[PDB]
Paper text:
Speckle-type POZ protein (SPOP) is a ubiquitin ligase adaptor that binds substrate proteins and facilitates their proteasomal degradation. SPOP is composed of three domains: the meprin and tumor necrosis factor receptor-associated factor homology (MATH) substrate-interaction domain and two dimerization domains, bric à brac, tramtrack, broad complex and bric à brac, tramtrack, broad complex and C-terminal Kelch. Among the regulatory signals that control Pdx1 stability and function is a degradation pathway wherein Pdx1 associates with a ubiquitin ligase adaptor, speckle-type POZ protein (SPOP). Notably, neither SB motif in Pdx1 conforms to the established SB consensus sequence, but high-resolution structural characterization suggests that the Pdx1 SB motifs share a binding mode with other substrates.
Numbering used by the authors: 26 to 165
């Protein structure tokens, strides 16, 4: 069977300034699929108030391999925010392809400062919506 080997996932979280998650609490995205027969399952994990005390001023963003048929998947990834114009901004990308196993995630604990994100001047929460964009390339 053929495989979806590169995929871009776009997720809008409504009313973001009112998310109620505390530090260490997660918002999980819908599961999205790739690979052969949709057998690689992924989701994005957002911690709106970080993981720990070190990151409580940040939003943390992680890509999680929810399911895979074998042991591992190696993948490169890039996260960004889509601004009020639909353009990518505040991008961060993996240094190389990282080894995912099922239940494992990789990402950025300090992806963006909350006070920058919440400042209307920066155009990152049009209508109080945060739109995240995740581009993945599976190399093995």
């Amino acid at each position: 069977p053929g495989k979806v080997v590169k995929f871009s996932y776009m997720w809008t979280i409504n009313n973001f300034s009112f998310c109620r998650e505390e530090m260490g609490e997660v918002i999980k995205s819908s599961t999205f699929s790739s690979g052969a027969n949709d057998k690689l399952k992924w989701c994005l994990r957002v911690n709106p108030k970080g993981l720990d005390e070190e990151s409580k001023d940040y939003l943390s963003l992680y890509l999680l391999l929810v399911s895979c048929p074998k042991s591992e998947v190696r993948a490169k990834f890039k996260f960004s925010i889509l601004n009020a114009k639909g353009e990518e901004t505040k991008a961060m990308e993996s240094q190389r392809a990282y080894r995912f196993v099922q239940g494992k995630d990789w990402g950025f604990k300090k992806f963006i400062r909350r006070d920058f994100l919440l400042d209307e001047a920066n155009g990152l929460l049009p209508d109080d919506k945060l739109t995240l964009f995740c581009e993945v390339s599976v190399v093995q």
